[PDB]
């Protein structure tokens, strides 16, 4: 069942990626698949019937092969590894529910949320919209160490509940770039245009490397302290579409299996900080999560009644790359008004 779970995870991430690129070709794409699927999985604890099976199938799980307990046990076990600080490597993740003041929730939902997702629970006065926004935004700001401050832009006075996930990552490169080797260089957006960026560089270093002649791309892994790493994929100019057409678990596995320690004469990587924020309603609908967004929503495992739907799924992610290492943060909010 672990391999079925693994296949679902990659499929969800790449299905999501393809929809994001379709909506905004040539724009930066920055997101955390796990932040999104964790929030949706947390929500599904309170979902029933079609609403529930749509959520879990939309996350690409196959319910004929993996049970709901096995899915939630997968999130539980993973989430238990995402709060550690060691050797300049920081990983943090939090889940929380912000619940309308005086609104009562079913014991099984609050128990399950705690046991499987480590969820925290805040009472919230959604009639004071400014203060409720500051509450939720402050929770995410604290969790992401100041990197994500405005997850919630708008909040409806009729909101019954907001479910929130955040993930925070910060590491030092195993072999850091020396800033004396960073220089202003061109970054080619395309054939018609370039932009000046601070280009970091490392000279005469051995790293995991694979040249894929069939996809016209170069794959390297840069290592962080604390046994973390990042896979970087560099398509040849105007071959991004070819790589994107081949994104799959099979391709990803082929990349990792093909990596070799290779001595590299020079490595150039930009120093940069970018962010994106998303309303994921349309894309989640495309992926098949439909009933939860409508009057047909059966979230009665939460409140005991069918008086709750999802109005908005928002996501923000931030990527910071610099000589010493990298910082990545993301957060997901599911807003749920009364119905």
């Amino acid at each position: 069942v672990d391999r079925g779970l693994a296949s679902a995870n990659v499929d969800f991430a790449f299905s999501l990626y393809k929809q994001l690129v379709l909506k905004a070709p040539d724009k930066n794409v920055i997101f955390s698949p796990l932040s999104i699927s964790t929030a949706l999985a947390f929500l599904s604890l309170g979902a029933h019937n079609t609403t529930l099976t749509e959520i879990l199938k939309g996350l690409k799980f196959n319910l004929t092969e993996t049970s709901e307990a096995e899915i939630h046990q997968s999130f539980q076990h993973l989430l238990r590894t995402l709060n550690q600080s060691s050797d300049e490597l920081q990983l943090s993740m939090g889940n929380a529910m912000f619940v309308k003041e005086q609104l009562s929730l079913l014991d099984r939902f609050t128990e399950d949320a705690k046991r499987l997702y480590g969820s925290e629970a805040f009472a919230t006065d959604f009639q004071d919209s400014a203060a409720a926004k500051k509450l939720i935004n402050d929770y995410v700001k604290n969790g992401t160490r100041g990197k994500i401050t405005d997850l919630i832009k708008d909040l409806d006075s009729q909101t019954m509940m907001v479910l929130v996930n955040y993930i925070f990552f910060k590491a030092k490169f195993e072999m850091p770039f020396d800033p004396q080797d960073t220089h202003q260089s061109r970054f080619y957006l395309s054939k018609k245009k370039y932009v000046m960026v601070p280009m970091m560089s490392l000279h005469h270093l051995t790293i995991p490397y694979f040249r894929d002649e069939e996809l016209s791309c170069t794959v390297v892994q840069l290592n962080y302290t604390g046994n973390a790493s990042a896979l970087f994929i560099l398509p040849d100019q105007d071959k991004m579409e070819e790589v994107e057409a081949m994104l799959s678990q099979e391709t990803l596995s082929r990349f990792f299996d093909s990596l070799e320690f290779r001595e590299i004469g020079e490595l150039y990587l930009p120093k940069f900080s970018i962010s994106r924020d998303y309303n994921l309603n349309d894309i989640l609908l495309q992926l098949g999560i439909e009933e939860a967004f409508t009057s047909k929503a059966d979230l009665s495992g939460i409140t005991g009644a069918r008086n709750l739907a999802v109005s908005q799924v928002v996501h923000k992610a931030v990527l910071d790359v610099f000589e010493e290492g990298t910082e990545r943060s993301a957060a997901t909010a599911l807003k749920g008004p009364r119905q």
């Binding site: 991430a13 698949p33 796990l34 970054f187 560099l234 020079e266």
Partner: protein
Amino acid sequence: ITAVETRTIVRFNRPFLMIIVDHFTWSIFFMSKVTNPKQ
């Protein structure tokens, strides 16, 4: 300064992908396409 003949240069001066994969679960913690580091 000095001149050297080298086999391999890796130069991220054009759009690229970064993918953060969990070993055990294959969960994708994070994924990005950088088409413009300045935006």
